[PDB]
Design an enzyme around this catalytic site. Structure first.
Site, PDB file in Angstrom:
ATOM      1  N   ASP A   1      -0.317  -7.294   2.266  1.00 19.66           N
ATOM      2  CA  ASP A   1       0.336  -5.985   2.257  1.00 19.66           C
ATOM      3  C   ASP A   1       1.852  -6.152   2.269  1.00 19.66           C
ATOM      4  OD1 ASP A   1       0.618  -3.259   2.216  1.00 19.66           O
ATOM      5  OD2 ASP A   1      -0.062  -2.919   4.272  1.00 19.66           O
TER       6      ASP A   1
ATOM      7  N   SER B   1       4.510   2.658   8.122  1.00 16.05           N
ATOM      8  CA  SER B   1       4.083   1.601   7.210  1.00 16.05           C
ATOM      9  C   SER B   1       5.213   1.141   6.298  1.00 16.05           C
ATOM     10  CB  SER B   1       2.913   2.081   6.343  1.00 16.05           C
ATOM     11  OG  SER B   1       1.790   2.405   7.134  1.00 16.05           O
ATOM     12  N   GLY B   2       5.285  -0.173   6.090  1.00 14.79           N
ATOM     13  CA  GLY B   2       6.315  -0.743   5.242  1.00 14.79           C
ATOM     14  C   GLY B   2       7.619  -0.931   5.994  1.00 14.79           C
TER      15      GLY B   2
ATOM     16  N   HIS C   1       0.793  -1.226   0.000  1.00 18.90           N
ATOM     17  CA  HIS C   1       0.000   0.000   0.000  1.00 18.90           C
ATOM     18  C   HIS C   1       0.827   1.278   0.000  1.00 18.90           C
ATOM     19  CE1 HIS C   1       0.549   0.266   4.444  1.00 18.90           C
ATOM     20  NE2 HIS C   1       0.227   1.537   4.282  1.00 18.90           N
TER      21      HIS C   1
HETATM   22  C1  LIG Z   1      -9.089   0.926   4.165  1.00 22.10           C
HETATM   23  S1  LIG Z   1     -10.154   0.152   5.320  1.00 22.10           S
HETATM   24  O1  LIG Z   1     -10.242   0.991   6.459  1.00 22.10           O
HETATM   25  O2  LIG Z   1     -11.373  -0.118   4.623  1.00 22.10           O
HETATM   26  C2  LIG Z   1      -9.519  -1.428   5.897  1.00 22.10           C
HETATM   27  C3  LIG Z   1     -10.152  -2.583   5.247  1.00 22.10           C
HETATM   28  C4  LIG Z   1      -9.779  -3.952   5.627  1.00 22.10           C
HETATM   29  C5  LIG Z   1      -8.756  -4.082   6.691  1.00 22.10           C
HETATM   30  C6  LIG Z   1      -8.115  -2.922   7.340  1.00 22.10           C
HETATM   31  C7  LIG Z   1      -8.480  -1.556   6.929  1.00 22.10           C
HETATM   32  C8  LIG Z   1      -7.733  -0.357   7.518  1.00 22.10           C
HETATM   33  C9  LIG Z   1      -8.110   0.281   8.797  1.00 22.10           C
HETATM   34  C10 LIG Z   1      -7.454   1.496   9.304  1.00 22.10           C
HETATM   35  C11 LIG Z   1      -6.378   2.076   8.508  1.00 22.10           C
HETATM   36  N1  LIG Z   1      -5.712   3.228   8.926  1.00 22.10           N
HETATM   37  C12 LIG Z   1      -4.419   3.227   9.361  1.00 22.10           C
HETATM   38  O3  LIG Z   1      -3.724   2.235   9.231  1.00 22.10           O
HETATM   39  C13 LIG Z   1      -3.832   4.355   9.972  1.00 22.10           C
HETATM   40  C14 LIG Z   1      -4.491   5.604  10.130  1.00 22.10           C
HETATM   41  C15 LIG Z   1      -3.547   6.411  10.823  1.00 22.10           C
HETATM   42  C16 LIG Z   1      -3.808   7.818  11.330  1.00 22.10           C
HETATM   43  F1  LIG Z   1      -4.190   8.594  10.331  1.00 22.10           F
HETATM   44  F2  LIG Z   1      -2.711   8.240  11.917  1.00 22.10           F
HETATM   45  F3  LIG Z   1      -4.713   7.776  12.241  1.00 22.10           F
HETATM   46  N2  LIG Z   1      -2.419   5.710  11.040  1.00 22.10           N
HETATM   47  N3  LIG Z   1      -2.571   4.449  10.545  1.00 22.10           N
HETATM   48  C17 LIG Z   1      -1.621   3.458  10.846  1.00 22.10           C
HETATM   49  C18 LIG Z   1      -0.488   3.086   9.959  1.00 22.10           C
HETATM   50  C19 LIG Z   1       0.472   2.022  10.331  1.00 22.10           C
HETATM   51  C20 LIG Z   1       0.331   1.317  11.609  1.00 22.10           C
HETATM   52  C21 LIG Z   1      -0.791   1.724  12.468  1.00 22.10           C
HETATM   53  C22 LIG Z   1      -0.947   0.994  13.789  1.00 22.10           C
HETATM   54  N4  LIG Z   1      -1.242   1.854  14.959  1.00 22.10           N
HETATM   55  C23 LIG Z   1      -1.765   2.766  12.116  1.00 22.10           C
HETATM   56  C24 LIG Z   1      -6.029   1.421   7.270  1.00 22.10           C
HETATM   57  F4  LIG Z   1      -5.026   1.993   6.627  1.00 22.10           F
HETATM   58  C25 LIG Z   1      -6.654   0.237   6.733  1.00 22.10           C
END
Ligand SMILES: CS(=O)(=O)c1ccccc1-c1ccc(NC(=O)c2cc(C(F)(F)F)nn2-c2cccc(CN)c2)c(F)c1
Ligand SMILES: [Ca+2]
Lengths: 52, 234
Positions: free
Chosen positions: B88, B185-186, B42
């Protein structure tokens, strides 16, 4: 216990062959003569922090 | 990284930073060898053209041990989808070989079976990156690391609003405010065994960061070792 027991005394990879412990290493490492330790082949083996 | 500590000199040599056209980091990665970087699929959707910087710890000062590498080929897992965030994972082959030195070294790729029964059964792992230090904040200019305990698969699933596939695993805290965050991430998730660090995961996602009742979600590296091997021969 073998590998289930302190990783069979291996430094890294541990598998069981003929119900015996056999140790192995990641690339960049050579298995020591005792067949347990992993010795680096260069100055920057994988997985080691650089405290120099 | 929310909480945790600053990566001191030589403590996280396998960390890589993906930088965009504007020369700013947007995602992390792990050094696997002089030619390959492991990262999240991603992360590729962002930044049309990007480079990889290794040996960095402070994005501000030009320190002297940093080094930028152009990507020769991007190997993204075809089964990845924003709809599930499953698979991912991606691998980057660089144009020129990375020269190892202080702060620049690869993390070890473990064997599947051994990693799962010996590494992932460990109490904790280590995650690192230049990501946000709070859900609402800018990317950290300093590289940070954070010890994150492995989270039981069962607890993981019921705590998640989204489906946790077999290519994923949880790490972090229930309430303690330390977690990975946007920008990490990554990046690397390594587990130490007898002073040797092996790549065990890839920062993937999470619902916010350091939220109570939520954990960080990582791509399970042991589930892609063969794919990684095949990719490194490409
Ligand atoms: C696309 S779906 O929702 O339909 C979805 C569909 C299916 C499975 C999972 C998801 C999913 C949920 C939340 C997220 N959002 C994040 O992962 C994120 C947001 C932020 C911040 F904006 F800061 F809030 N930081 N952040 C993040 C990045 C790396 C690790 C961690 C660890 N704590 C958090 C995302 F990408 C994907
Ligand atoms: Ca810099």
């Amino acid at each position: 216990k073998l590998c289930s027991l302190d990783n069979g005394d291996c430094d890294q990879f541990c598998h069981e062959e003929q119900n015996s412990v056999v140790c192995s290493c990641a690339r960049g490492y050579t298995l020591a003569d005792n067949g347990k330790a992993c010795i680096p082949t260069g100055p920057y083996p994988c997985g080691k922090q650089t405290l120099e | 990284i929310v909480g945790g500590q600053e990566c001191k000199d030589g403590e996280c040599p396998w960390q890589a930073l993906l930088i965009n056209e504007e020369n700013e980091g947007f995602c992390g990665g792990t050094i696997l060898s002089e030619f390959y970087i492991l990262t999240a699929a991603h992360c590729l959707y962002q930044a049309k053209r990007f480079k990889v910087r290794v040996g960095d710890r402070n994005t501000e000062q030009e320190e002297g041990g940093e080094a930028v590498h152009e990507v020769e080929v991007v190997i993204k897992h075809n089964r990845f989808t924003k709809e599930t965030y499953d698979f991912d994972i991606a691998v980057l082959r660089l144009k020129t070989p990375i020269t190892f030195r202080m702060n620049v070294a690869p993390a070890c790729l473990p064997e599947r079976d051994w990693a799962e029964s010996t590494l992932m059964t460990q109490k904790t792992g280590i995650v690192s990156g230049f990501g946000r230090t709070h859900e609402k904040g800018r990317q950290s200019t300093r590289l940070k690391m954070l010890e994150v305990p492995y989270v039981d698969r069962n607890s993981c699933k019921l705590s998640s609003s989204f489906i946790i596939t077999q290519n994923m695993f949880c790490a972090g805290y229930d309430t303690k405010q330390e977690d990975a965050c946007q920008g990490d991430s990554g990046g690397p998730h390594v587990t130490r065994f007898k002073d040797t660090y092996f790549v065990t995961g890839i920062v993937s996602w999470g619902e916010g960061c350091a939220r109570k009742g939520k954990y960080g979600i990582y791509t399970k590296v042991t589930a892609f070792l063969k794919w990684i091997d095949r990719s490194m021969k490409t």
